[PDB]
Design a protein around this ligand. Structure first.
Ligand SMILES: CC(C)COC[C@H](CN(Cc1ccccc1)c1ccccc1)N1CCCC1
Ligand SMILES: CC(C)COC[C@H](CN(Cc1ccccc1)c1ccccc1)N1CCCC1
Ligand SMILES: CC(C)COC[C@H](CN(Cc1ccccc1)c1ccccc1)N1CCCC1
Ligand SMILES: [Ca+2]
Ligand SMILES: [Ca+2]
Ligand SMILES: [Ca+2]
Length: 149
């Protein structure tokens, strides 16, 4: 909910902002349309249909603008943290190409293709998610990372 968004620390909002920035790369009016959602999806190795992408945009577009702005992105995230389990597993697998149950530094570099976010940002992301210091994020770490401890 809108209010719950204000429970996020200032650092969480910034991190979500960094993620939002990747989606709006080269976007009109800096908001996420089906076009940008399709580009990230494709960069992650998927091949969504127009119906699937439109379904995702409508699910989080609260003002019927047809696009997702940062405020709506935040609410969307707050909502998933506080079905979500399944999307999380798929997302993990999108990064875990060899299916060994880990996301290593190289696999995270997928986010630099056709791209705002930098290698330093990636190595930092890795440190944030890698709790046991083995240079990788396993599924349990990933879930804790995505849900918030
Ligand atoms: C590498 C694969 C294991 C991940 O793809 C799984 C897809 C993702 N979904 C939704 C989704 C998108 C983003 C993040 C998590 C889930 C999907 C839907 C439309 C287009 C591409 C993927 N789900 C489709 C139904 C069950 C599998
Ligand atoms: C997967 C979770 C961490 C966040 O859940 C949001 C995703 C799609 N997101 C994020 C996303 C999209 C593609 C690839 C990775 C993550 C989303 C993003 C932008 C616009 C709309 C939805 N689904 C929410 C319900 C249906 C959509
Ligand atoms: C799931 C999406 C809404 C984006 O989530 C963004 C980041 C890291 N993502 C990076 C990412 C960028 C763009 C699209 C999808 C994901 C991430 C990626 C891989 C492994 C761990 C985190 N999470 C860190 C803690 C909560 C936010
Ligand atoms: Ca909107
Ligand atoms: Ca892997
Ligand atoms: Ca680890």
């Amino acid at each position: 909910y809108k209010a719950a968004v204000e429970q996020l620390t200032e650092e969480q909002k910034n991190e979500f902002k960094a993620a939002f920035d990747i989606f709006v790369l080269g976007a009109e009016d800096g908001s996420i349309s089906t076009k940008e959602l399709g580009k990230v999806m494709r960069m992650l190795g998927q091949n969504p249909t127009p119906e699937e992408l439109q379904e995702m945009i409508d699910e989080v577009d609260e003002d019927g603008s047809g696009t997702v702005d940062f405020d709506e992105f935040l609410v969307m995230m707050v909502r998933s943290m506080k079905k979500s389990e399944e999307e999380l597993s798929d997302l993990f697998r999108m990064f875990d190409k060899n299916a060994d149950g880990y996301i290593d530094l190289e696999e995270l570099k997928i986010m630099l293709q056709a791209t705002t976010i930098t290698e330093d940002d990636i190595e930092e992301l890795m440190k944030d998610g890698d709790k046991n210091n083995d240079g990788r994020i396993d599924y349990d770490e990933f879930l804790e990372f995505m849900k918030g401890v």
